[model samples]
Target: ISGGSSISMMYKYCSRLPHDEFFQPKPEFQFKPVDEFGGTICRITLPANAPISEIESSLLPSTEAAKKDACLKAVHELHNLGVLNDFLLPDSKDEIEDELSD
Candidate 1:
């Protein structure tokens, strides 16, 4: 059981739709504690499960932080074609990580 998670960090990028500059509807993701096929266990979502204990921890507040990296990358574009450049101001990973902070 988990309670809350930084859903933003794990969510995927959404692309545009056909008409009126519409956008694709985002999908919902529910994380589980138990292991499974294609498993990507992370402490972030577990806090969002039940009996919350993640009030002050850091590093995305995690134990499976290493595992979280894979799952996060798994959602990164998935097929990021048809996505736009103008609106999102999306940057390339090769350089953006240099900023380090806001």
Candidate 2:
């Protein structure tokens, strides 16, 4: 009886949560599809805090070329937006270099 009551309470709490709150896209995130010589190109403007890994993961394509193009576009967009500087350099290059020397 106690187990059943606890399960009911858990369901109640989860039901009250907002529907859109779970996966709302950030305002900084943008998706644009453009026509290219080969196929449609996917251009994504990721959130400022988004890592380069996200740039690769966010692209959805069937071919390797398409994935490569998407990655290049992501880099171009980040550069145009002036956010590429933040990603171009390692956070601690000196520290890594020192460790590597030893």
Candidate 3:
């Protein structure tokens, strides 16, 4: 069979499959309220190949200031914990991309 045949077969199978079954799913970001901090905390296990830009962008809210601030604070807390410096920092962007690919 040709490559086109294989692609067609894949498409046929995918069409019959449930949406979640047809594609790999992205991990969900979980949020919990931190009473002491007066904000929510977000936790996500990113894919090894996920970019820092993706992480940063995901932490941002589309329309809420309180939610946006909470996410930003959560990110800052991650930075303070020394986890983000190794992978999510701006300077580490290229290095993380390269390391994950290799």
Candidate 4:
């Protein structure tokens, strides 16, 4: 998550994660999408000291692209760690949206 005015700035922070040092830019994101809203979402896992309010405070409406991206990234990380079969990223979107809406 990132502050509304700080999304681009926060990209640098996300890029700083030790494990994320190798994330490459994909060409698909540069092309026009078939679906206006479809795209890969960058899901990030924060450290213990990281703020939780970023996602909670996101002003943007949620969608499947966001969920899938986050899920896939977490899966990739777990796979790299040799524990993909054991650990998983949970889908808590409904629950989060409900809380944020309230």
Number of the top-ranking candidate, with lDDT as the measure: 2
List the candidate 1 regions with Cα displacement exceeding 4 Å. Answer: 1-30, 36-79, 92-102
Residues 52-87, candidate 3: write the lDDT tens digits: 311222233332333344334434444445443443
Against the true structure, candidate 1 has what lDDT? Answer: 0.29
| Per-candidate RMSD, Å | 14.6, 17.7, 15.3, 13.9
Per-residue lDDT over 1-102 for candidate 4, one digit per residue giving the tens place of the 0 to 100 score: 634323222232233334443333321111122333534334445433332211211112343344334433433443355333222222321123321211
- Candidate 2 per-residue lDDT, tens place, 23-43, comes to 224312223444443343333
> What C-alpha lDDT values do all the predictions have?
0.29, 0.36, 0.35, 0.31
Error of 3 at 6 (Å): 50
Which candidate tops TM-score? 2
On the 0 to 100 scale, the lDDT of residue 24 in model 2 is 29
Q: Arrange candidates by lDDT, descending.
A: 2, 3, 4, 1
Residue range 1-102, candidate 1, lDDT tens digits? 541232332322211112213233322223334434434333222112222211112223233543344334433433233233332323342132222211
Q: What is residue 64's positional error in candidate 1, in angstroms?
A: 4.8
- Name the Cα RMSD for model 4: 13.9
Question: TM-score of model 3 relative to the true fold?
Answer: 0.28
Error of 3 at 66 (Å): 1.8
Clashes of each: 10, 0, 0, 0
User: What is candidate 2's CA lDDT for residue 47?
Assistant: 52
Pairing residues by index, what is the TM-score of model 1? Answer: 0.25
| Prediction 4 global C-alpha lDDT | 0.31
